Ligand binder design. Structure first.
Ligand SMILES: O=C(O[C@H]1C[C@H]2CC[C@@H](C1)N2C[C@H](O)c1ccccc1)c1ccccc1
Ligand SMILES: O=C(O[C@H]1C[C@H]2CC[C@@H](C1)N2C[C@H](O)c1ccccc1)c1ccccc1
Ligand SMILES: O=C(O[C@H]1C[C@H]2CC[C@@H](C1)N2C[C@H](O)c1ccccc1)c1ccccc1
Ligand SMILES: O=C(O[C@H]1C[C@H]2CC[C@@H](C1)N2C[C@H](O)c1ccccc1)c1ccccc1
Ligand SMILES: O=C(O[C@H]1C[C@H]2CC[C@@H](C1)N2C[C@H](O)c1ccccc1)c1ccccc1
Ligand SMILES: [Cl-]
Ligand SMILES: [Cl-]
Ligand SMILES: [Cl-]
Ligand SMILES: [Cl-]
Ligand SMILES: [Cl-]
Ligand SMILES: [Cl-]
Ligand SMILES: [Cl-]
Ligand SMILES: [Cl-]
Ligand SMILES: [Cl-]
Ligand SMILES: [Cl-]
Ligand SMILES: [Cl-]
Ligand SMILES: [Cl-]
Lengths: 205, 205, 205, 205, 205
């Protein structure tokens, strides 16, 4: 255990704190969604609840090491409190997001980080026509709140949201689920801002 | 990254803590509102829920630097925990305000600070006549709870509320919305207190 | 700002922790109420909700200074976390009190402290006859949970509650509201305990 | 105040942490209940809500002192965070207990500790027949979750629950209320476990 | 008490932090369930609430000692905050789990740890046919969120869930209850992940 304890000590306690991405040192984050369930729809306030888990991937030079020097260690698990994390937020949320999983991430010797947080979200969506055979469609945007496109960029490995873990006896059937990257231009700010737009079509079971 | 790490170290770790504005050395905060949605109205308790995001701007001499000495760095992002923030509160709230965005602010080399917090608020408002063609009007005041006029002052760049991001399929239509500065005298206290009055006119879609 | 930073350093960091009033060092706290609104009444559980703000005043010798020695500073604002505060509680509450304002207090050079906390409270009250012209009356007691009369005493500047900020379009009109000091003798303890009784008479709008 | 500050420093900062009771060195806790109100009964889930305050008494040799050596000080108030406290829990609760009072305890020169916490509790109880003249009866057990009988023992000064502070206009009348000590044997574990069973008989007013 | 204080000091303060299991130093956790009550079923969102307590057992070499050297001490109780704990999570939860018991664990001289946490959980379950004589069946999986099989394995002493403490007057009758170990293979990852599946059969009184 001595080698892992030493590597951790050298990485986090010796060196100073990482101050995030800049225009000179930008980074890209890969996003992915696994939809688990549509728990409820509120027709009187136009609010819809989702249960899912997000995939977050990024790489930093400040986090890499030589495995040979630390007794052939390629990777390790660490609390998300010990490392820098991106600030990915939902634009149309109506209540604070609830966390449903432990906050631990995995770090590999090349500097790659993987973080998989599970959560419940309430957002703006009109459910009129969910009782029909054709169904109703809704969308929600995810992205960094404070950083532009010159500091953080976003990427998706596929445009098909993972439905391999969707609840079979849910009150609502999934007709389509997509994850597409998009660019925005805001009046306030002269820089573009990048997002990933989650679009879902569904109906009553 | 060494230069940004150095600037941050010199600003926050070397010098002591800023003890807030005084009567001798006072400051001014600029406010602005972006209304997103009227989620629900409760006719039985006269309570109304609002989802929006606030614009906060102030300047401090203790936060400025020469970009030339720190490798031509003009600005940076930092956690709101690291810097002093104004104590802006709503006078007619009925439940504690819910935060819906990350707490990160931006600092420029001249000492200017920008902070944009997203939140949900419940306040006192009679909705009688929202079902009419003319609609109903309500208001809520914002300002520093503990600081007087001789300590903190308020300013608005415009009188019109930003409605460019208002939810298109909301159950309620916005007829008018304004942000206007006020100066008040309370019975308790011999000093005046400044606030910004948010007045919204709406009806059923 | 150097003088205020120095005064604060000398008061809180040099000297040791204040261990609360004793029988050889007792203190008196002044109380006062500003009623804002009666939000709801529950006839099925006999519970009533209130929104208001309290006035707290006390003096300590450990907090006084000479303004002349610290560049003519008479007073300053500080987080309630930095100073000792009285343990004032409501005897008939049914749910934990919600805080609705920042926790900042003001300290003057003579050692006087002023703290104004805003809050929402749920307490025991039978609302039978609120629909009548005569209305219904209810009461709630406030005071120190642990400290007796030989450690902490209470005082009120007036016996009339401040109704100058009561919500005009509330579902309930106030007929009368009063604040009066009481001395209680409990079976548990040979010492007496001091409290202030808030009595409100109201009816439907 | 110098003497009290000194005594506190010598007790908590000089000596090491108390590691809780053992087999070779056990202790006894005295319990007592003051019933304030039965707030609501839920016939659809068989859940009942109670508002009350508990009496906790224990003695430790590590907490005693000579008053003569510390300027004739017999007792003092201290935050429950500074001292060891027993882990008394409710076996049939359905939601986490809500605290309704400050967490301060009193310590005397002989080593005796007194702690009086006020709280709201939801537990399993079938209310069928509360509308009858005979009424309905329910019970709930309190005791240490982790320590057996060979480490912690329990005691009651009386078997008659204190009803001198029960809410006069409650929707429910108290017929009888008792506090009795019990010794349990669980299938899992070879040691005996002690508890105090609270039994209440009530009906509609 | 000097010996126990010394043992605790030598174990936690002298040696460095345990960095969690690895492929070179893996461990196994034993699980067990005691079902207490089915509090409510929501047919409109397909959500079910459970109240129970879990059994957790694991062994570490970093936690063993010679009783002879520490005055014949075989075991002791300690706060779960002082030791490493497994990240055992429910896959189909819809709201954050509520804790209903103190967080204390027991450590024996051979390095074995026992932790018994009590909790309330809301998960995905279709209750259609609970009103029938045959009843309805539902399931939920438990296991570590981040560690694979080569780091954490699971075990059960029996396949029958403990029903000796199930609430007699519950609105729902239990007909069956089993705990069974499973091995999952995920696309994302190259190692197999283990879980323990909880299956309950029930109906209305
Ligand atoms: O910088 C600002 O806002 C931040 C940048 C953008 C715009 C609002 C919010 C905060 N950011 C949105 C973010 O890019 C986002 C977009 C879509 C989904 C998630 C996050 C700003 C806006 C108005 C006035 C002054 C400053
Ligand atoms: O300082 C006081 O009041 C504080 C200052 C002002 C007045 C009430 C509240 C607390 N503060 C209001 C603040 O100026 C404000 C106004 C409008 C919207 C938000 C905050 C005070 C109150 C009662 C007795 C003694 C002193
Ligand atoms: O010290 C006790 O309780 C404290 C003293 C009194 C009684 C309850 C509570 C805590 N104190 C009441 C408090 O002074 C108060 C009364 C009314 C409104 C607010 C606070 C006590 C009670 C019963 C048995 C042994 C000790
Ligand atoms: O020690 C255990 O549980 C603790 C001891 C007992 C049994 C459950 C709970 C926790 N304890 C009950 C406790 O004595 C109690 C009883 C009544 C009211 C409060 C606490 C245990 C249970 C099952 C398998 C292995 C170990
Ligand atoms: O490693 C991953 O996720 C972890 C492994 C598995 C799958 C989700 C979660 C985190 N783990 C589930 C866990 O094994 C579990 C299974 C059953 C009950 C509780 C926990 C992952 C998932 C998607 C894309 C890239 C990487
Ligand atoms: Cl709900
Ligand atoms: Cl920003
Ligand atoms: Cl709601
Ligand atoms: Cl409500
Ligand atoms: Cl103030
Ligand atoms: Cl929107
Ligand atoms: Cl007390
Ligand atoms: Cl309620
Ligand atoms: Cl409920
Ligand atoms: Cl145990
Ligand atoms: Cl870990
Ligand atoms: Cl992972």
């Amino acid at each position: 255990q001595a080698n892992l304890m030493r590597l951790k000590s050298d990485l986090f306690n010796r060196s100073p704190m990482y101050p995030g991405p800049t225009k000179d040192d930008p980074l890209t984050v890969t996003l992915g969604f696994t939809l688990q369930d549509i728990v409820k729809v509120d027709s009187s306030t136009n609010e819809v609840d989702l249960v899912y888990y997000e995939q977050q991937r990024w790489k930093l030079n400040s986090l890499m090491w030589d495995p040979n020097e630390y007794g052939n260690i390629t990777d390790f698990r660490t609390s998300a409190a010990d490392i820098w994390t991106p600030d990915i937020t939902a634009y149309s949320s109506t209540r604070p997001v609830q966390v449903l999983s432990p906050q631990i991430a995995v770090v590999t010797h090349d500097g790659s980080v993987m973080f998989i947080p599970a959560q419940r979200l309430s957002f703006m969506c009109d459910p009129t026509g969910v009782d029909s055979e054709e169904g109703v469609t809704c969308a929600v945007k995810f992205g960094s709140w404070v950083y532009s496109g010159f500091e953080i960029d976003l990427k998706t490995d596929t445009d098909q949201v993972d439905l391999s873990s969707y609840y079979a006896s849910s009150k609502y059937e999934i007709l389509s689920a997509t994850q597409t990257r998009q660019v925005q231009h805001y009046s306030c700010c002269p820089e573009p801002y990048i997002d990933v737009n989650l679009v879902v079509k569904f109906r009553e079971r």
